[PDB]
Design a binder for this molecule. Structure first.
Ligand SMILES: O=C(c1cc(Cl)c(O)c(Cl)c1)N1CS(=O)(=O)c2ccccc21
Ligand SMILES: *[C@@H]1O[C@H](CO)[C@@H](O)[C@H](O)[C@H]1NC(C)=O
Length: 515
């Protein structure tokens, strides 16, 4: 089939335009996942109280800070309490002679009247809308876990649907579903409905990812395939900065969600001009349509060979795969063979480490630094060169050292972030950025490396298993933040430990670079 591609053009105008078109949609797809750093930002909050918040109440000569001290006790963080208020105004606490021994838990009560939120940075957020605070604080990571579980289920459903219906058709309807569900989520009346719509949006996100990746491979020459994969990866790097800019411009969660969702109506529209995979059409016994698609691509590339292509070469050339693909093969086959068992274990561990670490760290930037807009931007700024250098290094120094070093660097940088004093926010932010860049380089390295570790018959099965492992770990990513009750260092300790152990294991893989 590579000869058919050469007759049509293995890397030309068509492939360039297609790659750009898909990269834009990947940028917006990235914005969809990173949105909840801003859409679900936690502002500073406190109980509503009469002396502070009922502006119609009798005025006094006291300043706002004195009223805040009179109304709200100091909390565990050595800062104003976020979930308890004084039952009666503590006038006794106003003099400098007072001491904390003068009041007890009997004087406190939960926020009967609700919470007051800081509006300086964000005009509105999900947390403020549905009071995902205090006793309900766990509901934010639950929502993110539901979104990632939606991705996992969408990936499970995409494969059979893609094979039965086609790459481009499923990509089109995934675009449409993303647009519809993202717009609907912006106007959700209640939190469970928001969760439902986010789940159904992730369901389509999975299809967009998988079919973009698949469709780029099948129209590209084998020699250029890794480079095209790397550019597809750079699409997310651009998505990060796009998220930072749009969130800087749009401080309202509904408008932000709507803005990042609307573009997918345009993606849905131009998906119709993309050609369906010719490999899929030939395999499914539709050579007449495959000829149309192939000569369309040749016309775009400007080749004269449209006068020479005929159904006979189309039918015969791919026939070998049409015959050999009739065997169903399974994940159990990988673990039966003694030699492949070890490679499979380590490869799946590395996939899991990538997914777990990335979606653990990237969705709580608020804990890593002071300014999340700038941090979000710099993640992409560093991700671009990290991914390109990963490509260069793995082509020059090998897959094994590159993957191992990337994972070790990410883990060591994240572990250091817990060790640095909290007051040095700049250094911690830099370490966080470097860790995430290392994670992106590791994603590139594992994507290229996993294809080369397995025999051609079992290649796709092992890669699918690895991807499922990564998407499973992504779910556990957010849940680990609930360990923050015992201190903010513990989640970062886990996030840093996992990549270190998986990177050390990667040193036990064989090298696949040609001599
Ligand atoms: O969600 C994925 C992804 C996961 C798997 Cl397991 C894949 O196979 C593919 Cl193609 C993509 N990414 C790849 S990323 O550049 O790290 C990145 C950065 C930011 C947001 C998402 C994301
Ligand atoms: C605020 O204070 C006024 C004082 O007249 C009172 O009528 C009103 O009910 C109070 N509102 C709340 C929410 O406490």
């Amino acid at each position: 089939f590579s000869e058919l591609l050469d007759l049509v053009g293995g890397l030309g105008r068509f492939q360039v335009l297609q790659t750009m078109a898909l990269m834009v949609s990947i940028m917006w797809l990235c914005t969809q996942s990173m949105l909840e750093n801003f859409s679900a930002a936690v502002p500073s909050h406190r109980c509503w109280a009469p002396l502070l918040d009922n502006s119609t109440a009798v005025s006094t000569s006291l300043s706002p800070e004195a009223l805040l001290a009179i109304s709200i006790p100091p909390g565990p963080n050595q800062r104003p309490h976020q979930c308890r208020r004084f039952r009666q105004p503590q006038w006794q606490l106003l003099d400098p002679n007072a001491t904390a021994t003068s009041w007890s838990e009997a004087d406190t009560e939960p926020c009967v009247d609700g919470w007051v939120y800081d509006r300086s940075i964000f005009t509105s957020t999900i947390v403020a809308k549905w009071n995902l605070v205090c006793d309900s604080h766990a509901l934010k990571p639950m929502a993110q876990s539901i979104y990632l579980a939606g991705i996992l289920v969408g990936a499970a459903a995409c494969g059979p649907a893609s094979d039965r219906f086609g790459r481009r058709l499923v990509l089109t309807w995934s675009y449409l579903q993303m647009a519809v569900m993202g717009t609907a989520a912006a106007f959700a009346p209640a939190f469970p409905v928001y969760c439902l719509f986010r789940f159904l949006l992730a369901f389509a996100v999975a299809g967009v990812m998988m079919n973009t990746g698949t469709l780029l491979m099948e129209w590209t020459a084998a020699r250029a395939r890794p480079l095209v994969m790397t550019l597809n990866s750079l699409g997310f790097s651009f998505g990060h900065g796009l998220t930072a800019a749009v969130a800087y411009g749009v401080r309202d969660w509904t408008l932000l969600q709507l803005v990042v969702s609307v573009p997918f109506f345009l993606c849905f529209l131009y998906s119709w001009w993309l050609p369906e995979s010719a490999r899929w059409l030939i395999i499914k016994g539709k050579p007449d349509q495959a000829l149309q698609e192939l000569r369309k691509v040749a016309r775009i590339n400007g080749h004269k060979e449209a006068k020479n292509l005929t159904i006979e070469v189309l039918m015969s050339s791919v026939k070998e795969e049409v015959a050999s693909a009739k065997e169903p093969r399974s994940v159990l086959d990988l673990f039966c063979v003694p030699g492949l068992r070890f490679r499979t274990c380590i490869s799946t561990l590395c996939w899991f480490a990538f997914g777990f670490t990335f979606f653990g760290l990237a969705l709580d930037l608020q804990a890593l630094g002071s300014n999340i807009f700038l941090l979000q931007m710099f993640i992409g700024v560093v991700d671009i060169p990290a991914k390109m250098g990963a490509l260069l290094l793995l082509s020059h120094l090998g897959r094994r050292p590159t993957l191992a070093a990337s994972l070790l660097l990410a883990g060591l940088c994240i572990l250091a972030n817990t060790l640095v004093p909290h007051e040095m926010g700049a250094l911690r932010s830099a370490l966080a950025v470097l860790g995430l860049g290392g994670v992106g380089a590791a994603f590139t390295c594992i994507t290229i490396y996993s294809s080369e570790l397995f025999p051609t018959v079992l290649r796709m099965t092992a890669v699918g298993l690895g991807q499922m492992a990564a998407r499973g770990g992504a779910i556990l990513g957010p849940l680990v933040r609930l360990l923050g009750v015992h201190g903010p260092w513990l989640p970062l300790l886990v996030y840093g430990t996992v990549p270190v152990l998986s990177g050390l294991a990667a040193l036990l893989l064989p090298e696949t670079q040609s001599l």
